[PDB]
Design a binder for this molecule. Structure first.
Ligand SMILES: Nc1nc2[nH]c(CCCCc3cc(C(=O)N[C@@H](CCC(=O)O)C(=O)O)cs3)cc2c(=O)[nH]1
Ligand SMILES: NCC(=O)N[C@@H]1O[C@H](COP(=O)([O-])[O-])[C@@H](O)[C@H]1O
Length: 200
């Protein structure tokens, strides 16, 4: 399966996907990395790995639909089968999401359905949970509501900050994102016609 990884920043999840997809038994290959932001570290990681990069500045488009259309053009250019959102921080339009339904994965740094949104660690810390975690899910139009593929719990330690908690949770993200990608790319897991996860 041919994979695009979309990023907005550091790219530690991208690096874990690069590492995993290069193992001999990987059913996935990363053929393109797309960033909505220029000069971010994830682009360095991609180039260093010899993977093509494209920057699609969302700041240059009239609306969300036109921006997503620009992404989709690149996806078609590289004959992509599966899209991974790896620290990509844009909400995607309905039509784009529906086109890639069952073929697009996202990593989220909470145990969904808790703490949806862009500041999950802040929320977890404010709420006072002692267990948080991360989630890989299929992307549906409703943000962070798509079908869950894998999750891993991570303890919150007393005195944790966003800095220390995100660091601990990223270790788990780097485990379950590659595992989830391999499940989907191998055809082991798919989105069911009833819209529920199907383990083949
Ligand atoms: N339809 C849909 N789109 C998705 N994008 C992502 C990927 C995860 C998105 C995380 C989140 C970003 C924002 C947000 O408000 N983003 C801003 C951009 C602000 C910025 O540039 O930092 C926006 O898009 O207007 C809220 S949660 C997941 C996901 C999803 O499940 N469904
Ligand atoms: N709602 C999406 C979200 O919060 N994504 C989070 O951004 C970080 C990106 O790190 P990375 O650039 O090192 O992969 C990751 O922790 C990811 O879960």
């Amino acid at each position: 399966a041919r994979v695009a990884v979309l990023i907005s920043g550091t790219g530690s999840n991208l690096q874990a996907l690069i590492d995993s997809t290069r193992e001999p038994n990987s059913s996935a290959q990363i053929d393109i990395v797309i960033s909505n932001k220029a000069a971010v570290a994830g682009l360095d990681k991609a180039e260093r790995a010899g993977i093509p990069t494209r920057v699609i500045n969302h700041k240059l488009y009239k609306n969300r639909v036109e921006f997503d259309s620009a992404i989709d053009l690149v996806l078609e250019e590289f004959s992509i089968d599966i899209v991974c959102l790896a620290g990509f921080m844009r909400i995607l339009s309905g039509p784009f999401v529906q086109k890639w339904n069952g073929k697009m994965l996202n990593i989220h740094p909470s145990l969904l359905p808790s703490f949806k949104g862009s500041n999950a660690h802040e929320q977890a810390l404010e709420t006072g949970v002692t267990v948080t975690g991360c989630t890989v899910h299929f992307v549906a139009e409703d943000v962070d509501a798509g079908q869950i593929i894998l999750q891993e719990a991570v303890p919150v330690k007393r005195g944790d900050t966003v800095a220390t908690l995100s660091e601990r949770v990223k270790l788990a993200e780097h485990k379950i994102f590659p595992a989830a990608l391999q499940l989907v790319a191998s055809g082991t897991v798919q989105l069911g016609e009833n819209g529920k996860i199907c383990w083949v």
